[PDB]
Amino acid sequence: GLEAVRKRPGMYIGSTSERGLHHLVWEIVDNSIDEALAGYANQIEVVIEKDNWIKVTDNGRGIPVDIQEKMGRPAVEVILTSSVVNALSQDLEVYVHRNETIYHQAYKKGVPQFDLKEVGTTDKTGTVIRFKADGEIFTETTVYNYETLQQRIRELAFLNKGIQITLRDERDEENVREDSYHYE
Ligand SMILES: COC(=O)NCc1cc(-c2sc(-c3ccccc3)nc2N2CCC(O)CC2)[nH]n1
């Protein structure tokens, strides 16, 4: 089912060009926005990291991790192994804060590298997604454009007043830029 994505990506994502690259960010973010619209998240952060990794953080409830009765996998693994973003990423990581626990899993091309495991304790809730778009699939470019992300971020915040959405470019550690939107 997921190899179907990696082989016919545009049928899911729409071209493998730059707009396709940026579509990835919006898929994860839209999801965080759902968490806000459901009334739990009020802080969303997007970071462009070295290597053009992308990180997205919200403080919603965190993707569920309970064993989803049917195959015996944590719901979050079940969900991530249906994520187009995961499928079109050469590496993807997730961290869930839930039940005062930090849960972690990593993937390659949508394939789980190991079982979901607890890697810490926390007094927060929420989800962290870090993914690195697949170079094999996004030829042409794998470099995110700041302006493009920023404009969409701004609309998204104005569309969802009361939700703080922060964008930050860390691809140059000596020169770090951030914009943060929070409309009353
Ligand atoms: C896969 O990566 C993301 O989409 N990350 C953004 C995100 C998603 C969620 C949550 S919390 C939750 C949830 C649902 C029921 C009860 C408690 C929490 N469900 C989700 N989504 C639902 C849609 C799926 O595509 C991804 C996971 N929090 N942050």
Curated annotation (Swiss-Prot):
Family in the record: Belongs to the type II topoisomerase GyrB family.
Protein purpose: A type II topoisomerase that negatively supercoils closed circular double-stranded (ds) DNA in an ATP-dependent manner to modulate DNA topology and maintain chromosomes in an underwound state. Negative supercoiling favors strand separation, and DNA replication, transcription, recombination and repair, all of which involve strand separation. Also able to catalyze the interconversion of other topological isomers of dsDNA rings, including catenanes and knotted rings. Type II topoisomerases break and join 2 DNA strands simultaneously in an ATP-dependent manner.
Note: Few gyrases are as efficient as E.coli at forming negative supercoils. Not all organisms have 2 type II topoisomerases; in organisms with a single type II topoisomerase this enzyme also has to decatenate newly replicated chromosomes.
Location in the cell: Cytoplasm
Subunit structure: Heterotetramer, composed of two GyrA and two GyrB chains. In the heterotetramer, GyrA contains the active site tyrosine that forms a transient covalent intermediate with DNA, while GyrB binds cofactors and catalyzes ATP hydrolysis.
Domain of life: Bacteria
Originating species: Staphylococcus aureus
Protein name: DNA gyrase subunit B
